[PDB]
Design an enzyme around this catalytic site. Structure first.
Site, PDB file in Angstrom:
ATOM      1  N   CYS A   1      46.583  23.569  66.963  1.00 37.30           N
ATOM      2  CA  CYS A   1      46.705  24.969  66.592  1.00 37.30           C
ATOM      3  C   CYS A   1      45.382  25.692  66.807  1.00 37.30           C
ATOM      4  O   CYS A   1      44.376  25.357  66.181  1.00 37.30           O
ATOM      5  CB  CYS A   1      47.154  25.100  65.136  1.00 37.30           C
ATOM      6  SG  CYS A   1      47.647  26.770  64.664  1.00 37.30           S
ATOM      7  N   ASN A   2      45.391  26.683  67.695  1.00 38.44           N
ATOM      8  CA  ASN A   2      44.205  27.489  67.978  1.00 38.44           C
ATOM      9  C   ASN A   2      43.687  28.191  66.731  1.00 38.44           C
ATOM     10  O   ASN A   2      42.505  28.531  66.639  1.00 38.44           O
ATOM     11  CB  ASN A   2      44.507  28.520  69.064  1.00 38.44           C
ATOM     12  CG  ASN A   2      44.933  27.882  70.369  1.00 38.44           C
ATOM     13  OD1 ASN A   2      45.840  27.046  70.402  1.00 38.44           O
ATOM     14  ND2 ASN A   2      44.268  28.262  71.455  1.00 38.44           N
ATOM     15  N   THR A   3      44.580  28.411  65.772  1.00 37.71           N
ATOM     16  CA  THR A   3      44.206  29.021  64.505  1.00 37.71           C
ATOM     17  C   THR A   3      43.518  27.992  63.615  1.00 37.71           C
ATOM     18  O   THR A   3      42.454  28.249  63.057  1.00 37.71           O
ATOM     19  CB  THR A   3      45.433  29.596  63.771  1.00 37.71           C
ATOM     20  OG1 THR A   3      46.468  29.886  64.722  1.00 37.71           O
ATOM     21  CG2 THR A   3      45.056  30.872  63.041  1.00 37.71           C
TER      22      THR A   3
ATOM     23  N   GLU B   1      60.725  30.256  72.192  1.00 37.51           N
ATOM     24  CA  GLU B   1      61.576  29.598  71.203  1.00 37.51           C
ATOM     25  C   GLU B   1      63.060  29.940  71.357  1.00 37.51           C
ATOM     26  O   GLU B   1      63.920  29.250  70.807  1.00 37.51           O
ATOM     27  CB  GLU B   1      61.101  29.894  69.774  1.00 37.51           C
ATOM     28  CG  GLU B   1      59.758  29.258  69.414  1.00 37.51           C
ATOM     29  CD  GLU B   1      59.349  29.499  67.967  1.00 37.51           C
ATOM     30  OE1 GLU B   1      59.301  30.673  67.544  1.00 37.51           O
ATOM     31  OE2 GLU B   1      59.068  28.511  67.256  1.00 37.51           O
TER      32      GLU B   1
ATOM     33  N   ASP C   1      50.221  20.290  65.075  1.00 38.00           N
ATOM     34  CA  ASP C   1      50.338  21.718  65.317  1.00 38.00           C
ATOM     35  C   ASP C   1      51.120  22.311  64.157  1.00 38.00           C
ATOM     36  O   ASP C   1      51.807  21.585  63.437  1.00 38.00           O
ATOM     37  CB  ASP C   1      51.060  21.979  66.637  1.00 38.00           C
ATOM     38  CG  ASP C   1      51.201  23.460  66.945  1.00 38.00           C
ATOM     39  OD1 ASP C   1      50.287  24.233  66.584  1.00 38.00           O
ATOM     40  OD2 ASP C   1      52.227  23.853  67.542  1.00 38.00           O
ATOM     41  N   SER C   2      51.002  23.622  63.966  1.00 35.98           N
ATOM     42  CA  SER C   2      51.725  24.311  62.903  1.00 35.98           C
ATOM     43  C   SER C   2      53.225  24.171  63.098  1.00 35.98           C
ATOM     44  O   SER C   2      53.936  23.720  62.203  1.00 35.98           O
ATOM     45  CB  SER C   2      51.349  25.794  62.870  1.00 35.98           C
ATOM     46  OG  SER C   2      51.863  26.480  63.999  1.00 35.98           O
TER      47      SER C   2
ATOM     48  N   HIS D   1      52.575  27.681  72.873  1.00 33.06           N
ATOM     49  CA  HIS D   1      53.912  27.957  73.374  1.00 33.06           C
ATOM     50  C   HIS D   1      53.842  28.360  74.843  1.00 33.06           C
ATOM     51  O   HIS D   1      54.765  28.113  75.615  1.00 33.06           O
ATOM     52  CB  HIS D   1      54.559  29.092  72.574  1.00 33.06           C
ATOM     53  CG  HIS D   1      54.826  28.756  71.141  1.00 33.06           C
ATOM     54  ND1 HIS D   1      53.837  28.340  70.274  1.00 33.06           N
ATOM     55  CD2 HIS D   1      55.970  28.788  70.418  1.00 33.06           C
ATOM     56  CE1 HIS D   1      54.363  28.124  69.082  1.00 33.06           C
ATOM     57  NE2 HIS D   1      55.656  28.388  69.142  1.00 33.06           N
TER      58      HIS D   1
ATOM     59  N   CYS E   1      47.554  29.940  73.432  1.00 38.44           N
ATOM     60  CA  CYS E   1      48.652  29.666  72.519  1.00 38.44           C
ATOM     61  C   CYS E   1      49.438  28.479  73.060  1.00 38.44           C
ATOM     62  O   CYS E   1      49.595  28.330  74.271  1.00 38.44           O
ATOM     63  CB  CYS E   1      49.555  30.886  72.349  1.00 38.44           C
ATOM     64  SG  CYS E   1      50.743  30.711  70.998  1.00 38.44           S
TER      65      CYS E   1
END
Length: 252
Positions: free
Chosen positions: A75-77, A155, A12-13, A187, A185
């Site tokens: 990462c969805n991106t 976060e 993941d990013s 998170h 997402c």
């Protein structure tokens, strides 16, 4: 140490993919999982497509020395744009979050005319990928909504309280209570208890982690392990801060 079984890696990013890492860890499908997070260059939604790709390729080169059986893009991106040039360079199955989420939504609805909501970052939405897909399979009652503020709330450890409620009340103003909500997402799985309680029993939460656990079972030959898997964490910048939240989200 070498044994005869399956070792995979999660990418993941930032730290979002830890929630994905959670669900995979509870599953006991592997013996060793390698988490890498490019925390130096967070977030990825800002960049155009080509740079995300050149960035994701740099993560593959990293995973090479470990030699994994399967790589998961958390990462969805990155899942939207990079999940292809990785395969034109990988010698092993590289998978992503979007299809698992979509398929798990469909299976959980089996009803073309049911009400679907999908929340994500501004970037995940603009790609329209989740939309471009669910429509192709004939699901009509769908809206997609950017709730980017949920990410920094996670976060900073905000998972409950009037403040988070005020956020939900803000984002969900005059909104149809959906039959199924997708968490596009990584998170967002940290706020689930608050969201369901907010939305009620009617809304069914589609967990990206749980969606990909059931996903790999359908696509791959997998054995459940008696022994729990071995975790590894790697970060571009500040590895130990990741290791902390890792212990926090999972409680190892």
């Amino acid at each position: 140490f070498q044994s005869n079984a399956m070792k995979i890696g999660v990418f993941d990013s930032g730290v979002g993919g830890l929630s994905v890492l959670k669900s995979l860890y509870e599953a006991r499908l592997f013996d060793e999982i390698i988490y890498y997070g490019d925390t130096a260059r967070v977030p990825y939604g800002v960049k155009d497509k080509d740079t995300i790709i050149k960035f994701c390729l740099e993560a593959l080169d990293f995973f090479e020395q470990f030699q994994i059986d399967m790589l998961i893009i958390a990462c969805n991106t990155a899942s939207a744009y990079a999940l292809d040039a990785l395969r034109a360079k990988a010698h092993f199955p590289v998978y992503g979050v979007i299809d698992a989420g979509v398929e798990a939504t469909i299976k959980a609805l089996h009803d073309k005319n049911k009400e679907i909501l999908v929340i994500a970052t501004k970037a995940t939405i603009k790609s329209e990928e989740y939309q471009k897909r669910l429509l192709s399979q004939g699901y009509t009652n769908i809206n997609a909504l950017a709730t980017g503020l949920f990410v920094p709330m996670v976060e900073e450890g905000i998972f409950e309280g009037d403040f988070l409620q005020s956020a939900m009340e803000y984002y969900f103003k005059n909104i149809t209570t959906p039959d199924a909500l997708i968490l596009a997402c990584t998170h967002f799985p940290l706020l689930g208890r608050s969201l369901s309680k907010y939305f009620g029993d009617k809304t069914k939460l589609i967990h990206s982690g749980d969606a990909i656990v059931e996903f790999l079972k359908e696509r791959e030959n997998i054995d459940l392990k008696n022994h729990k898997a071995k975790l590894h964490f790697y970060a571009s910048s500040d590895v130990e801060s990741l290791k902390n939240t890792a212990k926090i989200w999972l409680n190892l």
